[PDB]
Copies of this chain bind each other. A is one copy, B any other.
Amino acid sequence: GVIDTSAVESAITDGQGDMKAIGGYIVGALVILAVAGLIYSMLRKA
């Protein structure tokens, strides 16, 4: 006896792709803050 978590093991990876995936798009949005914030400084400083 045991418990056939065979496909269930690799299944975790299925969601994992989603995990890596969503991030790029948030972080792509985060990037605006790093530009706009330096632009916000730029127009006062430069």
Contact = CB atoms under 8 A, between A and B. Distances in A.
Interface of A: 1-5, 7-46
B45 A19 contact: no
Consensus secondary structure, chain A interface: helix
A46 B1 CA distance: 15
Oligomer: number of copies: 39
Given A35-B3, A35-B20, A15 B29 contact: yes
B33 A43 contact: yes
Of all A-B residue pairs in the complex, the 8 with the closest CB atoms, nearest first, are A12-B25, A2-B14, A30-B43, A19-B32, A23-B36, A1-B11, A3-B18, A5-B18
A5 B35 CA distance: 10
Nearest to A12: B25
